[PDB]
Amino acid sequence: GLTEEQRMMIRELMDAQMKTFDTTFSHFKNFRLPGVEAAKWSQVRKDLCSLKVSLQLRGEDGSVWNYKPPADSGGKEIFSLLPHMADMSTYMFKGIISFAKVISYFRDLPIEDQISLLKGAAFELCQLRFNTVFNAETGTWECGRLSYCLEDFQQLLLEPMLKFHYMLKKLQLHEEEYVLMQAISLFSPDRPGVLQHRVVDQLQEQFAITLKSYIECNRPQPAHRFLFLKIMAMLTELRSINAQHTQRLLRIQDIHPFATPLMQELFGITGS
């Protein structure tokens, strides 16, 4: 019951996703691993301990390495996983940039708006991709040979990013709905620096219309009543989480630099 432009739209997005989402993380390589003013620190300590994960690496030979992080004892140990996480986020950002560049609607925008939109949405599309490898039964992001497992329950869901992943996983979305969510986030007309506000706004509306129609054509079950509105509410929450985590990043970076060059570029850090 989709129009022809709507089916072409979904096919282009799925094509871009298929070409640029390394779902086995097979090409994530050469990453770092953990080794073998007072008010600023207290806030950063709170920022860092709100997510605690252990790390598992399954080798191509059947061997397994497992890393359990240190407890916060008031020193530099709270930073032990930052170089690794920076490498992982950098790898994901590259895939997200590649995703956007393949989409015709994005390619046709002026280069300055392309940059503004990626700066605005890269984090959000990364999280949307991460949700598809989230195992809500085990609290684990399954990234091919790497796993990130939440350290232990109802208390963990107080953390907005974690509540987001659990609530979104429960909607049991299709691949097509995830990639439409990515497009709606990417084409947000109100990111800092966008110039072609009206063009971007019209594109976003068409992706939202396509998503609403996809759900109506393919999900008649009473469990999916209001599904379109639930997804849109999650996207608004994701934007909120993005703003929160951007500020966390800049606070951590202020007293303990760790952002890679690509992260600096996307977050506006000039190197001076």
Ligand SMILES: C[C@]12CC[C@@H]3c4ccc(O)cc4CC[C@H]3[C@@H]1CC[C@@H]2O
């Ligand atoms: C998620 C945290 C804030 C956001 C940080 C971030 C934010 C953006 C990004 O590209 C990478 C990282 C790595 C470390 C993250 C932090 C580790 C714990 C903290 O809450």
Ligand SMILES: O=[S@]1OC[C@@H]2[C@H](CO1)[C@]1(Cl)C(Cl)=C(Cl)[C@@]2(Cl)C1(Cl)Cl
């Ligand atoms: O791309 S970044 O690096 C990955 C980290 C975060 C996302 O930012 C979270 Cl929210 C997710 Cl998702 C994963 Cl996976 C981890 Cl491991 C945690 Cl910290 Cl769990």
